[PDB]
């Protein structure tokens, strides 16, 4: 397969979303229910978009679904890690900032993330119950 396709600073991308559109974004995309941006710090989602842009780059029997506590979250952004490496992202995942659940370093990150997803994804449908 195809190896990804790395966002930069410099890079052309759509302007950023509302925190309501980028929620809605990814409700429609994994079939959930978040309501706050500070959701996506458990890493879950983050590990299931891998899967659905490159089938097979993330141990989703890894994941951690429910989970609630710091070194839960941190457990699930080390799989997105090996995603990433795996695939040739170079972006650095702030993994310590991200985990405290801290908004801005959150919201940030969701910001990068949906212009790398926009740049990679190429429409394929995606089962968010078979990683469960």
Same mark, same amino acid.
């Given at each position: ?8 600073? @410099?890079?052309? @991308?759509? #302007?950023?979303?509302? +925190? ?14 978040? @309501? &706050? *941006? #500070? ?10 978009? =891998?899967? =659905?842009? /490159? ?5 989703? +029997? !890894? ?10 979250? *941190?457990?699930?952004? !080390? $799989?997105?890690?090996?995603? /990433?490496? &795996?695939?040739? $992202?170079? !972006?650095? *995942? ?5 985990? !405290?659940? &801290?908004?801005?370093?959150?919201? #940030? /990150? *969701? ?20 990683? +469960?």
């Amino acid at each position: 397969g195809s190896m990804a396709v790395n966002v930069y600073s @410099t890079s052309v @991308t759509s #302007e950023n979303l509302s +925190r309501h559109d980028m929620l809605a974004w990814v409700n429609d995309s994994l079939h959930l229910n978040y @309501t &706050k *941006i #500070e959701q996506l710090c458990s890493g879950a989602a983050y590990c299931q978009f =891998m899967d =659905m842009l /490159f089938p097979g780059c993330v141990h989703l +029997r !890894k994941v951690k679904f429910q989970a609630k506590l710091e070194h839960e979250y *941190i457990h699930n952004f !080390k $799989v997105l890690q090996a995603a /990433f490496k &795996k695939m040739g $992202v170079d !972006k650095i *995942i702030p993994v310590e900032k991200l985990v !405290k659940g &801290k908004f801005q370093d959150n919201f #940030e /990150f *969701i910001q990068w993330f949906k212009k790398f997803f926009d740049a990679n994804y190429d429409g394929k449908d995606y089962n968010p119950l078979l990683a +469960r």
